[PDB]
Design an enzyme around this catalytic site. Sequence first.
Site, PDB file in Angstrom:
ATOM      1  N   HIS A 142     -31.781 -21.700 -23.961  1.00  0.00           N
ATOM      2  CA  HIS A 142     -31.692 -20.849 -25.154  1.00  0.00           C
ATOM      3  C   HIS A 142     -31.546 -19.375 -24.702  1.00  0.00           C
ATOM      4  O   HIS A 142     -30.682 -18.649 -25.193  1.00  0.00           O
ATOM      5  CB  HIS A 142     -32.968 -21.033 -26.008  1.00  0.00           C
ATOM      6  CG  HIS A 142     -33.118 -20.049 -27.134  1.00  0.00           C
ATOM      7  ND1 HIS A 142     -33.086 -20.393 -28.469  1.00  0.00           N
ATOM      8  CD2 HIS A 142     -33.341 -18.709 -27.109  1.00  0.00           C
ATOM      9  CE1 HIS A 142     -33.281 -19.285 -29.196  1.00  0.00           C
ATOM     10  NE2 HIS A 142     -33.441 -18.221 -28.422  1.00  0.00           N
ATOM     11  N   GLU A 143     -32.395 -18.938 -23.774  1.00  0.00           N
ATOM     12  CA  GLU A 143     -32.340 -17.552 -23.295  1.00  0.00           C
ATOM     13  C   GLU A 143     -31.041 -17.200 -22.577  1.00  0.00           C
ATOM     14  O   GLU A 143     -30.434 -16.158 -22.851  1.00  0.00           O
ATOM     15  CB  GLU A 143     -33.535 -17.216 -22.390  1.00  0.00           C
ATOM     16  CG  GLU A 143     -34.926 -17.441 -23.004  1.00  0.00           C
ATOM     17  CD  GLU A 143     -35.108 -16.853 -24.410  1.00  0.00           C
ATOM     18  OE1 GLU A 143     -34.376 -15.929 -24.826  1.00  0.00           O
ATOM     19  OE2 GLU A 143     -36.010 -17.334 -25.115  1.00  0.00           O
ATOM     20  N   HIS A 146     -28.024 -16.563 -24.658  1.00  0.00           N
ATOM     21  CA  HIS A 146     -28.005 -15.239 -25.300  1.00  0.00           C
ATOM     22  C   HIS A 146     -27.160 -14.282 -24.457  1.00  0.00           C
ATOM     23  O   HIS A 146     -26.511 -13.367 -24.983  1.00  0.00           O
ATOM     24  CB  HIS A 146     -29.421 -14.688 -25.445  1.00  0.00           C
ATOM     25  CG  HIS A 146     -30.098 -15.150 -26.734  1.00  0.00           C
ATOM     26  ND1 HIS A 146     -29.487 -15.016 -27.979  1.00  0.00           N
ATOM     27  CD2 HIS A 146     -31.302 -15.732 -26.962  1.00  0.00           C
ATOM     28  CE1 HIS A 146     -30.306 -15.506 -28.893  1.00  0.00           C
ATOM     29  NE2 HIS A 146     -31.392 -15.938 -28.303  1.00  0.00           N
ATOM     30  N   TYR A 157     -27.957  -8.673 -33.553  1.00  0.00           N
ATOM     31  CA  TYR A 157     -29.207  -9.371 -33.774  1.00  0.00           C
ATOM     32  C   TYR A 157     -29.959  -9.050 -35.052  1.00  0.00           C
ATOM     33  O   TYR A 157     -31.080  -8.560 -35.015  1.00  0.00           O
ATOM     34  CB  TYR A 157     -30.132  -9.195 -32.581  1.00  0.00           C
ATOM     35  CG  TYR A 157     -31.089 -10.354 -32.416  1.00  0.00           C
ATOM     36  CD1 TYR A 157     -30.627 -11.604 -32.001  1.00  0.00           C
ATOM     37  CD2 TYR A 157     -32.461 -10.191 -32.608  1.00  0.00           C
ATOM     38  CE1 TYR A 157     -31.506 -12.656 -31.772  1.00  0.00           C
ATOM     39  CE2 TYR A 157     -33.348 -11.234 -32.378  1.00  0.00           C
ATOM     40  CZ  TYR A 157     -32.862 -12.463 -31.959  1.00  0.00           C
ATOM     41  OH  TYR A 157     -33.735 -13.490 -31.701  1.00  0.00           O
ATOM     42  N   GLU A 166     -29.032 -16.763 -32.835  1.00  0.00           N
ATOM     43  CA  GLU A 166     -30.178 -17.633 -32.562  1.00  0.00           C
ATOM     44  C   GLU A 166     -29.809 -19.117 -32.564  1.00  0.00           C
ATOM     45  O   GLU A 166     -30.175 -19.847 -31.651  1.00  0.00           O
ATOM     46  CB  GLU A 166     -31.303 -17.375 -33.578  1.00  0.00           C
ATOM     47  CG  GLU A 166     -32.294 -16.310 -33.145  1.00  0.00           C
ATOM     48  CD  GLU A 166     -32.977 -16.687 -31.850  1.00  0.00           C
ATOM     49  OE1 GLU A 166     -33.613 -17.755 -31.801  1.00  0.00           O
ATOM     50  OE2 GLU A 166     -32.864 -15.944 -30.851  1.00  0.00           O
ATOM     51  N   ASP A 226     -38.564 -10.660 -39.245  1.00  0.00           N
ATOM     52  CA  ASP A 226     -37.830 -11.366 -38.199  1.00  0.00           C
ATOM     53  C   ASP A 226     -36.369 -10.915 -38.114  1.00  0.00           C
ATOM     54  O   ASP A 226     -35.458 -11.732 -38.030  1.00  0.00           O
ATOM     55  CB  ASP A 226     -37.929 -12.868 -38.512  1.00  0.00           C
ATOM     56  CG  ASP A 226     -37.409 -13.749 -37.400  1.00  0.00           C
ATOM     57  OD1 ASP A 226     -37.495 -13.382 -36.215  1.00  0.00           O
ATOM     58  OD2 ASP A 226     -36.931 -14.846 -37.720  1.00  0.00           O
ATOM     59  N   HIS A 231     -34.780 -16.238 -36.803  1.00  0.00           N
ATOM     60  CA  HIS A 231     -35.363 -17.513 -36.360  1.00  0.00           C
ATOM     61  C   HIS A 231     -35.635 -18.451 -37.557  1.00  0.00           C
ATOM     62  O   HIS A 231     -36.083 -19.583 -37.374  1.00  0.00           O
ATOM     63  CB  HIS A 231     -36.675 -17.310 -35.588  1.00  0.00           C
ATOM     64  CG  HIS A 231     -36.515 -16.544 -34.316  1.00  0.00           C
ATOM     65  ND1 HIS A 231     -36.640 -15.174 -34.254  1.00  0.00           N
ATOM     66  CD2 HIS A 231     -36.236 -16.953 -33.057  1.00  0.00           C
ATOM     67  CE1 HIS A 231     -36.445 -14.770 -33.013  1.00  0.00           C
ATOM     68  NE2 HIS A 231     -36.199 -15.830 -32.267  1.00  0.00           N
TER      69      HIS A 231
HETATM   70  C1  LIG Z   1     -39.972 -10.657 -28.251  1.00  0.00           C
HETATM   71  C2  LIG Z   1     -38.523 -10.680 -28.613  1.00  0.00           C
HETATM   72  C3  LIG Z   1     -38.074 -12.088 -28.941  1.00  0.00           C
HETATM   73  C4  LIG Z   1     -36.617 -12.082 -29.340  1.00  0.00           C
HETATM   74  C5  LIG Z   1     -36.135 -13.478 -29.549  1.00  0.00           C
HETATM   75  C6  LIG Z   1     -36.102 -14.351 -28.290  1.00  0.00           C
HETATM   76  S1  LIG Z   1     -34.383 -14.652 -27.648  1.00  0.00           S
HETATM   77  C7  LIG Z   1     -36.393 -15.786 -28.717  1.00  0.00           C
HETATM   78  O1  LIG Z   1     -35.762 -16.280 -29.661  1.00  0.00           O
HETATM   79  N1  LIG Z   1     -37.304 -16.470 -28.037  1.00  0.00           N
HETATM   80  C8  LIG Z   1     -37.562 -17.859 -28.402  1.00  0.00           C
HETATM   81  C9  LIG Z   1     -38.377 -18.586 -27.330  1.00  0.00           C
HETATM   82  C10 LIG Z   1     -38.304 -20.079 -27.446  1.00  0.00           C
HETATM   83  C11 LIG Z   1     -37.071 -20.733 -27.362  1.00  0.00           C
HETATM   84  C12 LIG Z   1     -36.978 -22.116 -27.540  1.00  0.00           C
HETATM   85  C13 LIG Z   1     -38.126 -22.856 -27.802  1.00  0.00           C
HETATM   86  C14 LIG Z   1     -39.363 -22.219 -27.882  1.00  0.00           C
HETATM   87  C15 LIG Z   1     -39.446 -20.832 -27.702  1.00  0.00           C
HETATM   88  C16 LIG Z   1     -38.220 -18.037 -29.771  1.00  0.00           C
HETATM   89  O2  LIG Z   1     -37.772 -18.859 -30.581  1.00  0.00           O
HETATM   90  N2  LIG Z   1     -39.275 -17.271 -30.025  1.00  0.00           N
HETATM   91  C17 LIG Z   1     -40.001 -17.347 -31.288  1.00  0.00           C
HETATM   92  C18 LIG Z   1     -41.456 -17.712 -31.026  1.00  0.00           C
HETATM   93  C19 LIG Z   1     -39.902 -16.030 -32.058  1.00  0.00           C
HETATM   94  O3  LIG Z   1     -39.577 -14.994 -31.444  1.00  0.00           O
HETATM   95  O4  LIG Z   1     -40.107 -16.045 -33.283  1.00  0.00           O
HETATM   96 ZN   LIG Z   2     -33.446 -16.242 -29.006  1.00  0.00          ZN
END
Ligand SMILES: CCCCC[C@H](S)C(=O)N[C@@H](Cc1ccccc1)C(=O)N[C@@H](C)C(=O)O
Ligand SMILES: [Zn+2]
EC number: 3.4.24.27
Length: 316
Positions: A142-143, A146, A157, A166, A226, A231
Site C-alpha cells: 500500500h505504501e 503511493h 491527497y 488511497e 480525514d 480512508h
Molecule cells: C500519518 C499520515 C498517514 C497518511 C496515510 C497513510 S499512506 C496510510 O494510509 N496509512 C495506512 C496504513 C495501513 C495500510 C494498510 C493496512 C493497515 C494500515 C492507513 O490506512 N492508515 C490508517 C490507520 C489511517 O491513516 O487512517
Molecule cells: Zn495510504
Amino acid sequence: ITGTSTVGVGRGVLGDQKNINTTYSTYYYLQDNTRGDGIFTYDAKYRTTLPGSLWADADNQFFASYDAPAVDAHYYAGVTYDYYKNVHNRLSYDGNNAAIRSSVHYSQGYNNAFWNGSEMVYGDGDGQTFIPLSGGIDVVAHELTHAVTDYTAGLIYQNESGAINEAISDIFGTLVEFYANKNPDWEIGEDVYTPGISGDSLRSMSDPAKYGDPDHYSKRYTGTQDNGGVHINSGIINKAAYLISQGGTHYGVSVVGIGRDKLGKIFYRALTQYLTPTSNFSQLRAAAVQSATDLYGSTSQEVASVKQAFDAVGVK
Ligand SMILES: CCCCC[C@H](S)C(=O)N[C@@H](Cc1ccccc1)C(=O)N[C@@H](C)C(=O)O
Ligand SMILES: [Zn+2]
Ligand SMILES: [Ca+2]
Ligand SMILES: [Ca+2]
Ligand SMILES: [Ca+2]
Ligand SMILES: [Ca+2]
C-alpha cells in the site's frame, strides 16, 4: 554503503523465518543490491528524524525482537518491487529503478505507516490497535504504491482524488498479497491490526460496510475529516475493484468477475495513462473503461464488467 552482497536470515513480526538480501562492509547492512538501485532499510530508533541510520547488524542474523519490523519492511519492499517489475514491467516506483528506502521504529507507539514523498515510514503500533506495521504485506505494498502514484497520476491527497489515491494503494496492496500468496484475502491490514481480536481488519474491499465504510456513492462522506474522507470514501472504489475481479450482485446490480490479473492490468493502465492530479470518481470510471477498451476492445466482457461494477457502486 559499498560492500559485498550477501544473504542473511531473520524472523519477521509474525515470527516467520525468511532470508534477506544484505550488504557486507564491516557490519552487515539491510541493503539489497539485487533490485534496481537498491532497497535500504533504516532504524529511526523511536525518534521522528528521518531516515535515521542504515540498519547495521554484526552477524547477519536478525532474530532479535527489535529486528523483526526491519526484516519485514526490507523483505516485503523486495516482494513489492518484484511484483511491479514482473507483472507490470515497471522498474521501481519511478520506472527507472529509484532506490527504495524505509525507516522502521518510527516514534513511540505510532499506529500508522506512510509514504512521505521520499520514503516509507513504519510505526511499531501500540501493541493493542496495531503491532509493527511492516508485518503486513498489504501495508508495505500500500505504501510503495503511493510512490508509484506520486510519479504517475499524482492524485491530490484530498476529497475524491485522495480517496482514489488511497483505493489504488489498497487495490495494489491486495494484488501484491495475492502475488506473494501470503494467506491472501480482500481484507486490509488483517495481519497487523488488533493483535487481541481474530478475524477483523482495518478495511474490507469485499464488504467495506463491515467496518463502517461506504460501499455506494450515495453513502459517501462529505465532511472535512480525514482529508475529506480519503480512508472512508476509498471503500466505494475498493468495492468496485473487488466486484470487477470477483463478481457479485451489489444493490441489485450484477457484475461478472474477470479476475485479479485483468483488474491489475486495467487499473495500472488507468493510473499510468489516464489519471491526473485532480481526477474524481466519475473520471476514474471513464479512465478504467478506456483502459479496458484499449486492452480488450469496446465490446469485451472486461469493458462490460467495469461498467457494471461502477454502476453497482453508483459511480457514473
Ligand atoms: C500519518 C499520515 C498517514 C497518511 C496515510 C497513510 S499512506 C496510510 O494510509 N496509512 C495506512 C496504513 C495501513 C495500510 C494498510 C493496512 C493497515 C494500515 C492507513 O490506512 N492508515 C490508517 C490507520 C489511517 O491513516 O487512517
Ligand atoms: Zn495510504
Ligand atoms: Ca544479529
Ligand atoms: Ca491476508
Ligand atoms: Ca490483506
Ligand atoms: Ca485483529
